[PDB]
Design a protein around this ligand. Structure first.
Ligand SMILES: OC[C@H]1O[C@H](O[C@H]2O[C@H](CO)[C@@H](O)[C@H](O)[C@H]2O)[C@H](O)[C@@H](O)[C@@H]1O
Length: 272
């Protein structure tokens, strides 16, 4: 199917390591979550379930050496993050750029050491659009100032998204993974994919991005609702989705669960 799979990593202290996740060969993107603290007088902080940030340095490089794109996700499902001021946007943009998207300038420091990430993922779950458009604008400007990195977003499945809808409308994102879960109005539920398919139709039609990925839970325990078994996704979801020029593949939540479920292995025919 040539399927590209994006996966979130960093949700569990005890999860399969970052390097081992990349070694699976199942993913085109691994999204480290999350920078879940910023804004509102706060200094930015990571919540990567107790994993050592510095410890990630070599793992990230290993991932990239095997051609897996490694992104940092800002926000997340939960967390004391906000971005209501223009200053907040400027601060976070410069912070992300200096620290994660450029080689060391040898002065301050960097959470992931001297590793250079392949992009930033907007997983904004609350607060409304606030100043996220400005953040994207500044990061996008950097994208044009010599640092070739990607900008992605993870909106919930109701179109348009209340938090990222406007930013998405700017066409600034290289790719978007819609969370087709935790919302019965637009995800699989009751052995019925109508709501899911209608939502996919609208997203593939209206989202101003080159690639739209369908995000699914990798296990029934991974989300409150919306889990769809892999065989059902292949049978039911792919034929229609593949007819879209914007179909990018799927996103899974998350590595910890995927390791248990073998969802990606099943979707791919076992892609070791
Ligand atoms: O001091 C409490 C924190 O310790 C860890 O983070 C520090 O030590 C890591 C190596 O064990 C470094 O990679 C990291 O850069 C240091 O800040 C721990 O990972 C944190 O969760 C603790 O709060």
């Amino acid at each position: 199917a040539n399927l590209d799979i994006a996966v979130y990593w960093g949700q569990n202290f005890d999860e399969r390591s970052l390097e081992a996740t990349c070694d699976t060969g199942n993913y085109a993107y691994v999204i480290i979550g999350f920078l879940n603290t910023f804004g509102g007088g706060q200094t930015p902080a990571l919540d990567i379930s107790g994993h050592s940030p510095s410890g990630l340095e070599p793992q990230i490089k290993h991932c990239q050496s095997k051609n897996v794109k490694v992104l940092l996700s800002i926000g997340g499902p939960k967390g004391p993050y906000s971005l209501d001021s223009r200053s907040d946007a400027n601060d976070l943009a410069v912070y992300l750029f200096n620290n994660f998207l450029l080689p060391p300038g040898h002065s301050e420091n960097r959470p992931f050491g001297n590793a250079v990430l392949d992009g930033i993922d907007f997983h904004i779950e609350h607060g409304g659009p606030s100043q996220y458009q400005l953040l994207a604008n500044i990061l996008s400007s950097f994208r044009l100032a010599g640092t070739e990195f990607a900008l992605t977003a993870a909106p919930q499945c109701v179109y348009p998204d209340p938090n990222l809808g406007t930013v998405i409308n700017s066409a600034t994102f290289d790719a978007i993974w819609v969370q087709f879960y935790n919302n019965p109005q637009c995800s699989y539920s009751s052995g019925n994919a109508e709501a899911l398919m209608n939502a996919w139709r609208e997203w593939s039609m209206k989202a101003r991005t080159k690639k739209v990925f369908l995000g699914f839970p990798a296990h029934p325990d991974a989300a409150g609702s919306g889990y769809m078994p892999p065989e059902k996704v292949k049978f039911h979801v792919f034929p229609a989705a593949k007819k879209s020029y914007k179909f990018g593949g799927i996103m899974l939540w998350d590595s910890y669960w995927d390791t248990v479920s073998n969802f990606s292995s099943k979707i791919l025919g076992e892609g070791w």
